[PDB]
Design a protein around this ligand. Structure first.
Ligand SMILES: Cc1ncc(COP(=O)(O)O)c(/C=N/[C@H]2[C@H](O)[C@@H](O)[C@@H](OP(=O)(O)OP(=O)(O)OC[C@H]3O[C@@H](n4cc(C)c(=O)[nH]c4=O)C[C@@H]3O)O[C@@H]2C)c1O
Ligand SMILES: Cc1ncc(COP(=O)(O)O)c(/C=N/[C@H]2[C@H](O)[C@@H](O)[C@@H](OP(=O)(O)OP(=O)(O)OC[C@H]3O[C@@H](n4cc(C)c(=O)[nH]c4=O)C[C@@H]3O)O[C@@H]2C)c1O
Lengths: 393, 392
């Protein structure tokens, strides 16, 4: 049995070099330090300095909008948006997303309201929205899943119908577009993320982008103790400021972006090719949905076809030093404190959540690495039944 | 002559601007070494080693077992509130930076303001019980300018009303009273490591406590509530400190003891250079217990000097001396609190209208102290004339 050579089965782990989904993409150290030197020299370290402003600029350009406010992280970005907009009560959003989408709002007292995805896209289904609306609904927050843009036009249409605002969690969408429109320019306002793990990172950081100047001014003021906000806000304000240092990392990362995308695309094609003709394993075709950054390599594992559940596949690879993640599983509607509360039906969400597996990518991964993983996946898929059986023992 | 004051058209007194809040320089080499190691490892956030070491150093300095490093002190308070399960009302001073009440308002809590002990500037424990209500969940004091709060007495009160006691220890790192370090005084305390503090991490803060459970709850919630068996009604958020911030903070802590010493020296120089100056009173923090002296504060008595705190600021400002009123006015006069109903806060108001923060830190030398002082001495000796000429 080739299964016994499986470290998972107590065999020897095939390789010494660990592969990790999320590995930050390398940068030009020299460029970063200059940037840091310059800020240290000026003694201007935070509170709206020149690096942040520069970043905000590039960021907004990329979104195809006029304004951007740089933040400490995207989650805080969601909170400012909500507060700045005076959102109240319920917010309709997919359950198929990272915990931060609902939690960000729940943290500041809002009520996430979960609606199903369009199984063909993985994004919030506009046709499921209306049924979720109530006297308490203030808005709709869609998620460009894996960078695929939502059906904003349709979503917008429903929104309108119920006198609701329309925003997007564009955490994964930097550099993505649909029908030539870039993500960040589709909602009333959108939130980007610059976490260490994204295509573009600033250690920790985010940005709220919008074409709405007034809205933009409120967010800016609220992110700075509510200072300089005529009339203030019932929320008061907070600290969600991006320091010059993060902006330094942020700009240097934006610099590498073009090449990161390229590698991402290449890595993607590579996986596609290495996993070709493998029943029950499918490489997610992000391209079908518009221009994608390819920061996420996702496959769906069909347990019926393969005879092995995604989870087990995960474990098997982890044992081999290949760290994958299930982005996302389960749906947020199954996480605390949502877990067990009444929710609209979410069969599409639940089904996808159980099949998804994210594989290592970015500048840290090359062909050889790819093959090693594809090969491991191919083994699992073609010998699932026996692998599961042997595990079952 | 006043005609000379750059504020009266005259030429600006010195060219090298002095800034309250200028960050103390650091050992860049030690900084870059740290950054390099983080970059190399490819571990940039999410509880990295620098962050862990920092938390360890910070907790030791606070005189407690645990510390959770955050993206900022404001978020620190929010994690603390939610982790704690606070609800409804929270009693705190109005004599503080906006962030104390705002931090809480932001997450839907109601700040309840109480007056300060005019003789300290800290939440007067007396005034506390009066503000209690059935909505009241906790008491949050502010170690004003590093000055340790009368914690014990406050605890008593808290205890009697079944409340919780926490402190916004934003400026209290390394301050102490009767040998007890700021950070070990309340149920938990929050420090700030903003670029402008004694200890800088660009942006950052930390929640310290001896309460291991609280500590773990704080930790889980700062990371989207992950690994919090049972979760929380708040859900969770992201308030993590990156390894980059940690690198800076460690470097900053490396130089802290020396900073304090310099600060201490600075204060003495200002004290001496400002003697025999009625209505211009150098705040003696030390009387409140050991202080790190990051804040050089003077009270301007308008009736005595014949010149208002504000105009003095303006005058100094024109001379290249950038000062700040820490804090003016009281939070109660701040939106959204403003206009809404509060207890009487005469002490807060009095104090708020007099305070003035002077430049200090490693960049401030004796010579500079002289220049500021000679500048203040003039305003306070010719308040009348100056004030009046202005008003033309
Ligand atoms: C839809 C959506 N909305 C909102 C947000 C919130 O935006 P932010 O507030 O974070 O700016 C996110 C975040 N989405 C991101 C999270 O930011 C990231 O922490 C990770 O959520 P975790 O999986 O819990 O992080 P972690 O388990 O510590 O690391 C994940 C993988 O990355 C690797 N890694 C991680 C870091 C930090 C590193 O420095 N190096 C590294 O190799 C280790 C591991 O294999 O991925 C999510 C999809 C999101 O996906
Ligand atoms: C009692 C209390 N609780 C809680 C907090 C919240 O801690 P954090 O969430 O920020 O970690 C604070 C913060 N207290 C600090 C604030 O952190 C700081 O922004 C500054 O509040 P601002 O005056 O509104 O920021 P800014 O006007 O840009 O700084 C004023 C002075 O600092 C100088 N400066 C500032 C920066 C950012 C710099 O990089 N270099 C520099 O020289 C310029 C100027 O003379 O001082 C406050 C008392 C606090 O005092």
């Amino acid at each position: 049995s080739a299964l016994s050579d499986l470290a998972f089965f107590g065999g020897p782990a095939a390789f010494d070099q660990p592969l990790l989904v999320g590995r930050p993409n390398r940068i030009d150290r020299a460029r970063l330090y200059e940037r840091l030197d310059r800020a240290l020299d000026s003694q201007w370290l935070s509170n709206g300095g020149p690096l942040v402003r520069e970043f905000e600029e590039r960021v907004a350009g990329l979104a195809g909008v006029r304004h951007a406010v740089a933040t400490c992280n995207a989650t805080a970005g969601l909170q400012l948006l909500a507060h700045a907009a005076g959102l109240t009560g319920e917010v309709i959003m997919p359950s198929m997303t990272f915990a931060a989408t609902p939690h960000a709002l729940r943290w500041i007292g809002l009520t996430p309201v979960f609606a199903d995805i369009d199984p063909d896209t993985g994004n919030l289904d506009p046709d499921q929205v209306a049924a979720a609306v109530t006297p308490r609904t203030s808005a709709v927050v869609g998620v460009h899943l894996w960078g695929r843009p939502c059906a904003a036009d349709q979503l917008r249409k429903v929104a309108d119908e119920h006198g609701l605002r329309l925003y997007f969690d564009a955490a994964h969408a930097l550099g993505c577009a649909v029908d030539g429109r870039p993500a960040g320019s589709l909602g009333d306002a959108e939130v980007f993320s610059f976490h260490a793990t994204k295509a573009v990172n600033a250690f920790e950081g985010g940005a709220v982008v919008t074409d709405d100047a007034d809205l933009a001014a409120r967010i800016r003021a609220l992110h700075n103790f509510g200072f300089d906000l005529p009339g203030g806000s019932p929320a008061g304000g907070t600290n969600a400021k991006m320091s010059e240092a993060a902006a330094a990392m942020g700009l240097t990362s934006l610099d590498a972006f073009p090449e990161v995308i390229d590698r991402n695309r290449r890595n993607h094609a590579a996986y596609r090719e290495h996993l070709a003709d493998l029943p029950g394993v499918l490489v997610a075709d992000h391209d079908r949905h518009g221009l994608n950054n390819h920061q996420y390599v996702i496959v769906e594992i069909d347990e019926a076809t393969t005879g092995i559940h995604r989870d087990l596949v995960m474990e098997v690879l982890k044992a081999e030093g290949v760290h994958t993640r299930a982005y996302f599983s389960p749906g947020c509607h199954e996480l605390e404190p949502y877990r067990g509360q009444p929710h609209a039906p979410l069969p599409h969400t639940e089904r996808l959540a159980a099949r998804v597996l994210s594989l290592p990518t970015g500048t840290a991964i090359g062909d050889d690495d790819i093959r090693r993983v594809a090969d491991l996946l191919r083994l699992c898929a073609t010998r699932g039944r026996e692998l599961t059986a042997r595990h079952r023992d």
